[PDB]
Amino acid sequence: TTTLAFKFQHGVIVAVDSRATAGNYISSSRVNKVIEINPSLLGTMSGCAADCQYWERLLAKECRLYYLRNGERISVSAASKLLSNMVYQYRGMDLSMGSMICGWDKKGPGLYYVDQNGTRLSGNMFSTGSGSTYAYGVMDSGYQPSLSPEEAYELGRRAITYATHRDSYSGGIINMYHMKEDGWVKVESTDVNELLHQYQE
Amino acid sequence: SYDRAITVFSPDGHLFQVEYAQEAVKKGSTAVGVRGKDIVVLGVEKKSVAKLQDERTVRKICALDDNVCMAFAGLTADARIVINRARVECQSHRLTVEDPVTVEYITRYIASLKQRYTQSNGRRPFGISALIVGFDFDGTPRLYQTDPSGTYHAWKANAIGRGAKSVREFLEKNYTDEAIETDDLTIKLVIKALLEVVQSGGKNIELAVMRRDQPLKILNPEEIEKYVAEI
Amino acid sequence: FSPYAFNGGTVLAIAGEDFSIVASDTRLSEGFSIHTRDSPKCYKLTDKTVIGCSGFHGDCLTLTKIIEARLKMYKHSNNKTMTTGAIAAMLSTILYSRRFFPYYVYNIIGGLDEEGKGAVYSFDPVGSYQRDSFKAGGSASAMLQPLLDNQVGFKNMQNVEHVPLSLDRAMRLVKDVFISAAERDVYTGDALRICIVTKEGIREETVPLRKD
Amino acid sequence: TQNPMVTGTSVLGVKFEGGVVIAADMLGSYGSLARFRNISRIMRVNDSTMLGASGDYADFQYLKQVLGQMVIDEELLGDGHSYSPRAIHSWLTRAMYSRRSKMNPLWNTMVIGGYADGESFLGYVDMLGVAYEAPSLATGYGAYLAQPLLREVLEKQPVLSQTEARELVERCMRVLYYRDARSYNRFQIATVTEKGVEIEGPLSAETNWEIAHM
Amino acid sequence: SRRYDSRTTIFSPEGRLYQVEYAMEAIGHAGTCLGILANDGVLLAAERRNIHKLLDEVFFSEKIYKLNEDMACSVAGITSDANVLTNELRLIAQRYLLQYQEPIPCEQLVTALCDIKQAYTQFGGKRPFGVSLLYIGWDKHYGFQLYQSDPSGNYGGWKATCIGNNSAAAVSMLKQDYKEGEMTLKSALALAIKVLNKTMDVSKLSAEKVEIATLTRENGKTVIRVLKQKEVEQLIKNHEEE
Amino acid sequence: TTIMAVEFDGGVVVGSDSRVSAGEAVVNRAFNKLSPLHQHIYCALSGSAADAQAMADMAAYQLELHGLELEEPPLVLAAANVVRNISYKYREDLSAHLMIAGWDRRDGGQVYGTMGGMLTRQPFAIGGSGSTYIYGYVDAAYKPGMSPEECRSFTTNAIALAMNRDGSSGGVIHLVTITAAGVDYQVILGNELPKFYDE
Amino acid sequence: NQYDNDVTVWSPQGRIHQIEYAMEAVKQGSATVGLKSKTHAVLVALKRAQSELAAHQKKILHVDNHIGISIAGLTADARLLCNFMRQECLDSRFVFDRPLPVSRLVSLIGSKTQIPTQRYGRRPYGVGLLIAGYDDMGPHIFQTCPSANYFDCRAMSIGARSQSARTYLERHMSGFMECNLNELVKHGLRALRETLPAEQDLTTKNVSIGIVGKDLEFTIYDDDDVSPFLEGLE
Amino acid sequence: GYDLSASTFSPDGRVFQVEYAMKAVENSSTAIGIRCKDGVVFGVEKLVLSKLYEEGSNKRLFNVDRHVGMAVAGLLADARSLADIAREEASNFRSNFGYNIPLKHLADRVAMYVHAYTLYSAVRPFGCSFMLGSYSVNDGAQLYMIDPSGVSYGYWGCAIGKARQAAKTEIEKLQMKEMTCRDIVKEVAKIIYIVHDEVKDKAFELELSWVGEITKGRHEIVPKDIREEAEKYAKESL
Amino acid sequence: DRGVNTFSPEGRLFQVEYAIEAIKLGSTAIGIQTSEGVCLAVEKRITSPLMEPSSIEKIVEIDAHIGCAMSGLIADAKTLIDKARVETQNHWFTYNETMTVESVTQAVSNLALQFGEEDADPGAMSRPFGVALLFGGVDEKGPQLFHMDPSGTFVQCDARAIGSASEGAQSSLQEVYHKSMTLKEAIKSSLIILKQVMEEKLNATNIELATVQPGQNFHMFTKEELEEVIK
């Protein structure tokens, strides 16, 4: 698994690969590693698929309940804090979940990294999963805060593509989103092999 | 464990215990809250003001947080319990949402706790009514009022305790946009509204204001005296 | 003392435009022996949903009875039969409830969705699931999946018409891949039970496999 | 249990035309020592159900007591409803599975025989909760030594009579005594038909030791 | 059983709690206690009601309890109840010291006992504690302090107060004579004797009928001390001369 | 530890050795392993001393109450069932076998084995660490229709043979004969023990 | 006066007023009829409507594939009991893999509803029930009461003016065993219509039918589905 | 209000609440129990309140154990729960001691449970009286009766219900000690028909059950043929 | 004195009957179900000019497709409202679908008789809820309207009027509602009935109104929208 996220001048880019595995066996090449909590809130998944899917859906439930009760959409920081506290109750029981909470509330764009250990950090850019180190290299070498939308899409597409090329547990399709002030939009779903061949041309 | 139902329905759908709790609020000292443009003022009567009593220990205007404070009427002992509960909730909210609670949010919590005590076994209703003021993150001033039953509304200017009706009648006919124009004027309104019931006008009133962003402030005897001279 | 046992078996589901096939072998094994040659792994849930379960037979029996009870409970409180998708989502939570003493079952749901199209949901033991076009689970799942990718998904083929999968062709594919899995996987054999789910209802079929 | 103490070996089960036959030796083993050589491992549940158990004898006695009370309890009602072979098999399956899920299993492998509504029933229930039914069964060492002989005869003649099934069962017992080191040459043969449950024994198998001179 | 329930913690039709009001009647009949706060200290002065000649003296005092190094209290009303409350204040102070490694501030201690008293008024079906306390303490936040609490769980800080028999009279007498900020422990003690001479209907006061603890600071250490009979006698003498 | 109980027309004969060991050290060389649960019901303890004593005391208490409630001498089967239940319920915690032998007015003299929670009635029973060495001997010497005198001899011989071979057994032989008349104890000291091939 | 407030207070005549007051709740409920033949068991109830713009209240609930019920009295209690019945049936199918015999399920209800009639502070269930089912002993029609008593009957009726239906039921019960499905349903309808006012009549709005037989799972017919049965009534 | 709770004694030392529960058993159908030479016979005058009820509904004769039968009078719901309690006792005894519970012990245990509901205001006394009958070769025939107070006594002949004062005199004139189950079944039936009121409490059914040597120690409903004869000899001789 | 679970001589629970009496003193709420959707209209009943009209919430959103109009003891409703909110979200988490209006109403209706004072556990209600609800939403069966009272009885309605003017409003409802009625007409008719049964002069501030139609989410009417329909 490779997932990344970075904030630039025109919002937040979120990109993931779609490979799931069981040992050396590729169980799926089309798994969805982004949950859509609401129109301006997203969550990435990496680690144990059952843990990620279950806890991120439970966060979505609480976010929806938060909205109904307080009559407003939960902030990115409060949503990430909710998840952080939820998984801290099972610390040490071998949960495996590394996720990013991306959205846009009243304090502009927001990106948080949350993991099963209880780590919770706000930042400008993050990468998780087994192919994260490879993604960091590409992302960091081509990141500029004044990147244009098309340029930001390319960087995201490149970072993930290269991670799938080197990391055995990453691959399939790159799914990318773009968090904007009026909500997120799904950018593309490009097969990483199509991309890689064109990059080598 | 005591599991007797204290609050029950009567023939005409009346909860006697809740109404008895409201009777206790009526014997409480008058408390007035006025929502101004950029300020929030609370004013409680001091009733019997002895000369041997430490003034600072029996204040009826406490702070729940930096942006939220409250004045009550009725059973003082009951008020203390409620205030502590609210304070604990404010720190809980600040720790799980990383933000100062909104005035309405804590008002909702206190109201909910009061309702819970009208439908639970072994307990009686809280015998107090509260006026909650403060400012939310955006800067808008708020003023709420909760009662023993658990119901709560947002107000512009309200009065609780003995003489609440009298003060309400005078506040309606005195609350306008040209009455809360400036901070001074807003404070005068509360003081003038408190002068309609509180006997021996002057040092028989406890005043405290909450300006935007800053912490709760308490007016001193001579500071209140000056205001009284202008009225 | 171990509370699990590997009882073998393979399950396959295929989704078509207006049909769903769920098939499995009927061998029940333990160690190097055969418990019985007549233990099918597909259960009928509703009139348009079938579940294939493989893995530890103890958990397969218990999980199918829990799902059957939850279907009735849902019908009693909602006055309708659970849809294939609602069954999939509920199964996920049931499997995650035992996250620290997990059911050793590989589930594959096959049925029709609300629009009447074939649907297939695959599951891992702790509940992670997704909708697929075709999926193989259990003992010989790694022998069957690649063939399905090439023959159904048309992977790795150039200049090939991607014609929609007919029920007829789907049935021949299922029988073929199970015959090939009976040659290589020791846990797969005896007989093949195929359930076809269409709008007319569910019809079963049984094809003999190698007994050795 | 965690560590079975006294245990019983294989249990045989064969379905026939109008009934079910079940056999088991009368030995309670303590490790490799034949400690209790005259114990019954076959129990009559009700008029149409019989049960043979392998494994921990104490657990088998506990199940017998719990099953016996259930049959008695239901009989007190006298409402015309009685547990069928399938219902007993289902209950046993659930009981074993529940115990296995609490990491405190009942160390037994049981065979259920029965006859109700002109239909014979033969079910297997192990300690893990694994349950199923077949034309013939054999627990423990019988699965590798007796089951193959039973299946061979059922492959050529799916439906056999009471005599044929009885003769086949005796042939398996002889083979079990020869090759199983935890077996004893004193067994019981339980038969369930429309008349009810009949438990005969103690029986013995005629052994041949002609190979010793070879 | 609803039939035998007395219904201790419910309101009356006027929004009153009768058990609390009747617990208060108990107190107004107990022995008089009075507290005066001076610049250099605080004192408690209590009528003794254990007076019979055959009473042995064995104890620190009848009605004055030490709570921790920096505070004491005297109690009015149901003695056995007061024993429950005074033991609880000792536990509360030691809980605080254990947690913060500092003495409990006097108002935090008062408040925490009063929470226990308010709970008996609101839930659980038991009668309240029939006790009013006066508490004297020194802390680093406010220095010399005097509190009163009552069976409602209500409390308030005072310069001078009185509870028990003839409290109303004592209070009007303290309102006449107490000098804000101008009071010394000598002056306070004098006033105590004056007020105690008038609230007690035995004409001659007698140093056997009263108990006086003072609380002072000496070298950064609180000192609580029951006056001995000689000192009280002298104190009485000194009032006679006036 | 070697324990034994034999049935005879009219009652039972219970016997055991008297050695309590702690590794290689004899902590008690004259211990009585025969405990009376009731007037006509006895039990032979084997395994863990603490466990056996704890269970025997428990059973005696339970049987005592039972006896008084029903106003009748308890059955030997009831005593065995009381022991079986305790032994089965705490099978993972306890490590001792309480052999049950006695006499009642319903089924005469009965011998029950309650090892590990399993209950079985036998003509004669042997338990303890020294019982393994006398399995062959009792199988070849036991004959149905043995008289009380013959049962005591049979018991004495068997235990003596086990005591000489087993390191965990030894000392003296405690003997008890239970019948309608009552309970009659007997102790066979070291010098009066049956002698066999000890070379 | 002092004896009709608690369920644990025996009156001087040897009665328990609270249980008698709970039975009044079943008598105020809408009438419902239950009868059986030789192979079938049917339930017919008159659905009440608060107003003209309101939907008729549900009166026939599902319990299992072989068991169905008809309620009268406190609907909240009826739903409570129904849930309990559903669970018991589910448990029986989970443990023994077979339908729970109707008679055994009825005994569980009796025991469950008996408890609250002996404990201080508790109250009896204020709902009467009509249970139709089909097991190995054929079709059954049971009637549960608020005082935990239950009767096995050939036909029964509970609710407002159910005595008239009972009178009709007793007069035509001789030809119930040999009656067919269509025929048996008519008798119930006729008996159900006997408790209705002279003016009012049974239609496809205030009538609900539930049948369970030899080869038929317990099904409920509402409005338009009750047209066939309604067509033919004299 | 001295008669409002079971935990309250009246001025003359009486527990009226328990006595009120006995009034509920007094205004109920009559059941009889007879201890013969080799068994026990139970007979109940089942009152059929409606014609709609199925033949055999509201049985007042229960099987609490293989060798034990129970005949009750009073609140059927209360009696039914007591029967379940009795069944629990018997079952628990067998699991603890390994054999059939003696009738006397079973009766004592159930009576103590019944006695437990007569000391507090939290619960009310049971509104039913019942009989326990059983037969074994080691115990012979035993018959016991328990009421709302919790008192348990052994009998030779017993009657409970509204007509127990009249049925006792009819049971009195009989030589049950030398009689047998086969012969006592006709007398029980006869006696039941005698005490039964015609005008008042119309329409009744006869319930008959027995346990003894004839039934080999198992408690069961008296056979249709034998019951026929008994009922035929009851109507003809009345 | 009787317990809360005491039955009367007419076979009714005293407490539940008294709770139904409490609903008559509440404001008037109107619900109309049409093929276009479901509209809910309740009078705010403002008792003072200083009280903020937006703080009075009589109509709340249970979910996107389910709205709720309460009447009676408003504070008691809050607890039932949260339960309904949690039930739908729980249903979505487990079954990945929306809960039907009937189902939500059923779940909320099950808590109605869950009160006592002897066999209950630490957290049980000591009395029934004193409020009537109106559930309006759209599922697979289309627009739906449900009404639940304090007795736990819930039923589908074409048009329902709860509150103080329940009797008079219901009469106007049946005499002006048909099966072919449109949403626009339903919204107008409800407002016409609300204005006739209100003691105060109906305007755009003293009333609330929400609609739930196929496709559209739960939508509360704004001041502007309200005014348009008031002409």
Side-chain angles (χ1 to χ4, degrees), chain E residues 164-206:
Chain E
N165 182 32
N166 294 318
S167 79
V171 169
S172 274
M173 200 165 196
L174 283 165
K175 282 198 231 284
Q176 276 163 37
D177 294 73
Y178 183 86
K179 300 283 155 267
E180 260 209 69
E182 309 164 49
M183 228 66 211
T184 85
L185 199 73
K186 300 263 209 74
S187 201
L189 274 175
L191 174 57
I193 296 305
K194 173 161 186 285
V195 172
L196 230 32
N197 175 85
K198 191 125 288 154
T199 66
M200 297 184 75
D201 312 277
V202 293
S203 292
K204 255 172 294 187
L205 218 162
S206 197

Coordinates of all heavy atoms in Angstrom, one line a residue, chain E residues 164-206:
Chain E
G164 N -25.8 27.9 66.4 CA -26.3 27.2 67.6 C -27.2 28.0 68.3 O -27.8 28.9 67.7
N165 N -27.4 27.8 69.6 CA -28.4 28.5 70.4 C -28.0 30.0 70.4 O -26.9 30.4 70.5 CB -28.5 27.8 71.8 CG -29.5 28.5 72.7 OD1 -30.5 29.0 72.2 ND2 -29.2 28.5 74.0
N166 N -29.1 30.8 70.1 CA -29.0 32.3 70.3 C -28.0 32.9 69.3 O -27.4 33.9 69.6 CB -28.7 32.7 71.7 CG -29.8 32.4 72.7 OD1 -30.9 32.6 72.4 ND2 -29.4 31.9 73.9
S167 N -27.9 32.3 68.1 CA -27.0 32.7 67.1 C -27.4 34.1 66.6 O -26.6 35.0 66.5 CB -26.9 31.7 66.0 OG -28.1 31.7 65.1
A168 N -28.7 34.3 66.2 CA -29.3 35.6 65.9 C -28.9 36.8 66.8 O -28.8 37.9 66.3 CB -30.8 35.5 66.0
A169 N -28.8 36.5 68.1 CA -28.5 37.5 69.0 C -27.0 37.8 68.9 O -26.5 38.9 68.9 CB -28.8 37.1 70.4
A170 N -26.2 36.7 68.8 CA -24.7 36.8 68.7 C -24.3 37.7 67.5 O -23.4 38.5 67.6 CB -24.1 35.4 68.6
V171 N -25.1 37.4 66.4 CA -24.8 38.1 65.1 C -25.0 39.6 65.2 O -24.1 40.3 64.8 CB -25.5 37.4 63.9 CG1 -25.4 38.2 62.6 CG2 -24.9 36.0 63.7
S172 N -26.1 40.0 65.7 CA -26.4 41.4 65.9 C -25.4 42.1 66.8 O -25.2 43.3 66.7 CB -27.8 41.7 66.3 OG -28.7 41.7 65.2
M173 N -24.9 41.3 67.8 CA -23.9 41.8 68.7 C -22.5 41.9 68.0 O -21.8 42.8 68.4 CB -23.8 40.9 69.9 CG -23.2 41.6 71.1 SD -23.5 40.6 72.6 CE -23.1 41.8 73.9
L174 N -22.2 41.0 67.1 CA -21.0 41.0 66.3 C -21.0 42.2 65.3 O -20.0 42.8 65.1 CB -20.7 39.7 65.6 CG -20.2 38.5 66.5 CD1 -20.4 37.2 65.8 CD2 -18.8 38.7 66.9
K175 N -22.2 42.4 64.7 CA -22.4 43.5 63.8 C -22.2 44.9 64.4 O -21.8 45.8 63.7 CB -23.8 43.5 63.2 CG -24.2 42.5 62.1 CD -25.4 43.0 61.3 CE -26.5 41.9 61.2 NZ -26.2 40.8 60.2
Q176 N -22.4 45.0 65.7 CA -22.2 46.2 66.5 C -20.7 46.4 66.8 O -20.3 47.6 66.7 CB -23.0 46.1 67.8 CG -24.5 46.6 67.7 CD -25.3 46.1 68.9 OE1 -24.8 46.1 70.0 NE2 -26.5 45.7 68.6
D177 N -20.0 45.3 67.1 CA -18.7 45.4 67.7 C -17.5 45.0 66.8 O -16.3 45.4 67.1 CB -18.6 44.6 69.0 CG -19.5 45.2 70.1 OD1 -20.7 45.1 70.0 OD2 -18.9 45.8 71.0
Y178 N -17.7 44.3 65.7 CA -16.6 43.8 65.0 C -16.1 44.9 64.1 O -16.8 45.5 63.3 CB -17.0 42.6 64.1 CG -15.8 42.0 63.4 CD1 -15.0 41.0 64.0 CD2 -15.5 42.4 62.1 CE1 -13.9 40.5 63.3 CE2 -14.5 41.8 61.4 CZ -13.7 40.9 62.0 OH -12.6 40.3 61.3
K179 N -14.7 45.2 64.2 CA -14.0 46.2 63.5 C -13.3 45.6 62.3 O -12.3 44.9 62.6 CB -13.1 46.9 64.4 CG -13.7 47.6 65.6 CD -14.4 48.9 65.3 CE -15.5 49.3 66.2 NZ -16.8 48.8 65.8
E180 N -13.7 45.8 61.0 CA -13.1 45.3 59.8 C -11.6 45.8 59.8 O -11.4 47.0 59.7 CB -13.8 45.7 58.6 CG -14.7 44.7 58.0 CD -14.9 44.8 56.5 OE1 -13.9 44.5 55.8 OE2 -16.0 45.1 56.0
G181 N -10.7 44.8 59.8 CA -9.3 45.1 59.6 C -8.6 45.6 60.9 O -7.3 45.5 61.0
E182 N -9.3 46.1 61.9 CA -8.8 46.7 63.1 C -8.8 45.7 64.3 O -8.4 46.1 65.4 CB -9.6 48.0 63.4 CG -9.7 48.9 62.2 CD -10.8 50.0 62.4 OE1 -10.8 50.6 63.5 OE2 -11.6 50.2 61.5
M183 N -9.1 44.5 64.0 CA -9.3 43.4 65.0 C -7.9 42.7 65.2 O -7.3 42.3 64.3 CB -10.3 42.4 64.5 CG -11.4 42.0 65.4 SD -12.4 43.4 65.8 CE -12.8 43.0 67.5
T184 N -7.6 42.5 66.5 CA -6.4 41.7 66.9 C -7.0 40.4 67.6 O -8.1 40.5 68.1 CB -5.4 42.3 67.8 OG1 -5.8 42.2 69.2 CG2 -5.2 43.8 67.6
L185 N -6.2 39.4 67.7 CA -6.6 38.2 68.4 C -7.0 38.5 69.9 O -8.0 37.9 70.4 CB -5.5 37.2 68.3 CG -5.9 35.7 68.7 CD1 -6.8 35.2 67.6 CD2 -4.7 34.9 68.9
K186 N -6.3 39.5 70.5 CA -6.7 40.0 71.9 C -8.1 40.6 71.9 O -8.9 40.3 72.8 CB -5.8 41.1 72.4 CG -4.3 40.9 72.5 CD -3.9 40.5 73.9 CE -2.4 40.9 74.2 NZ -2.3 42.3 74.3
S187 N -8.3 41.5 70.9 CA -9.6 42.1 70.7 C -10.7 41.1 70.4 O -11.8 41.2 71.0 CB -9.5 43.1 69.6 OG -10.6 44.1 69.7
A188 N -10.4 40.2 69.4 CA -11.3 39.1 69.0 C -11.7 38.3 70.3 O -12.9 38.2 70.5 CB -10.6 38.2 68.0
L189 N -10.7 37.8 71.0 CA -11.0 37.1 72.2 C -11.9 37.8 73.2 O -12.8 37.2 73.8 CB -9.7 36.7 72.9 CG -9.0 35.5 72.3 CD1 -7.6 35.3 73.0 CD2 -9.8 34.2 72.6
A190 N -11.6 39.1 73.4 CA -12.5 39.9 74.2 C -13.9 39.9 73.8 O -14.8 39.7 74.6 CB -12.0 41.4 74.2
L191 N -14.1 40.2 72.5 CA -15.4 40.2 71.9 C -16.1 38.8 72.0 O -17.3 38.8 72.4 CB -15.3 40.6 70.4 CG -16.5 40.5 69.5 CD1 -17.6 41.4 70.1 CD2 -16.2 40.9 68.1
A192 N -15.4 37.7 71.8 CA -15.9 36.4 72.0 C -16.6 36.3 73.4 O -17.8 36.0 73.5 CB -14.9 35.3 71.8
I193 N -15.8 36.6 74.4 CA -16.3 36.6 75.8 C -17.5 37.5 76.0 O -18.5 37.1 76.6 CB -15.2 36.9 76.8 CG1 -14.1 35.9 76.7 CG2 -15.7 37.1 78.2 CD1 -14.5 34.4 76.9
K194 N -17.5 38.7 75.4 CA -18.7 39.6 75.4 C -19.9 38.9 74.8 O -20.9 38.8 75.5 CB -18.3 40.9 74.8 CG -19.5 41.9 74.6 CD -18.9 43.3 74.4 CE -20.0 44.4 74.3 NZ -20.7 44.4 73.0
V195 N -19.8 38.4 73.6 CA -20.9 37.8 72.8 C -21.3 36.5 73.5 O -22.5 36.2 73.6 CB -20.5 37.6 71.4 CG1 -21.5 36.7 70.6 CG2 -20.2 38.9 70.6
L196 N -20.4 35.8 74.1 CA -20.7 34.5 74.7 C -21.3 34.7 76.1 O -22.1 33.9 76.5 CB -19.4 33.7 74.8 CG -19.4 32.2 74.4 CD1 -20.4 32.1 73.2 CD2 -18.0 31.7 74.0
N197 N -21.0 35.8 76.8 CA -21.6 36.2 78.0 C -23.1 36.6 77.8 O -23.9 36.4 78.8 CB -20.9 37.4 78.7 CG -21.5 38.0 79.9 OD1 -21.3 37.5 81.0 ND2 -22.3 39.1 79.8
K198 N -23.5 37.0 76.6 CA -24.9 37.4 76.3 C -25.7 36.3 75.7 O -26.9 36.4 75.7 CB -24.9 38.7 75.4 CG -26.3 39.3 75.3 CD -26.2 40.8 75.7 CE -26.1 41.0 77.2 NZ -25.5 42.3 77.5
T199 N -25.1 35.4 74.9 CA -25.8 34.3 74.3 C -26.1 33.1 75.2 O -27.0 32.3 74.9 CB -25.2 33.8 73.0 OG1 -23.9 33.2 73.3 CG2 -25.0 35.0 72.0
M200 N -25.4 33.1 76.3 CA -25.6 32.1 77.4 C -26.4 32.7 78.5 O -26.0 33.7 79.1 CB -24.2 31.6 77.8 CG -23.4 30.9 76.7 SD -21.9 30.3 77.4 CE -22.4 28.8 78.3
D201 N -27.5 32.0 78.9 CA -28.5 32.4 79.9 C -28.1 31.6 81.2 O -28.9 30.8 81.7 CB -29.9 32.2 79.4 CG -30.2 32.8 78.1 OD1 -30.5 34.0 78.0 OD2 -30.2 32.0 77.1
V202 N -26.9 31.9 81.7 CA -26.4 31.5 83.0 C -25.7 32.6 83.7 O -25.0 32.4 84.7 CB -25.4 30.2 82.8 CG1 -26.2 29.0 82.4 CG2 -24.3 30.5 81.9
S203 N -25.9 33.9 83.3 CA -25.4 35.1 83.9 C -23.9 35.1 84.0 O -23.2 35.8 83.2 CB -26.1 35.5 85.2 OG -27.5 35.8 84.9
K204 N -23.3 34.4 85.0 CA -21.9 34.1 85.1 C -21.5 33.1 84.0 O -22.0 32.1 83.9 CB -21.5 33.6 86.5 CG -20.8 34.6 87.4 CD -20.7 34.2 88.9 CE -22.0 34.0 89.6 NZ -21.7 33.7 91.1
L205 N -20.4 33.5 83.2 CA -20.1 32.8 82.0 C -19.4 31.5 82.4 O -20.0 30.4 82.0 CB -19.1 33.7 81.2 CG -19.2 33.6 79.7 CD1 -18.5 34.8 79.1 CD2 -18.7 32.3 79.2
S206 N -18.4 31.5 83.2 CA -17.6 30.3 83.7 C -16.8 29.6 82.6 O -17.3 29.2 81.6 CB -18.6 29.3 84.4 OG -17.9 28.4 85.2

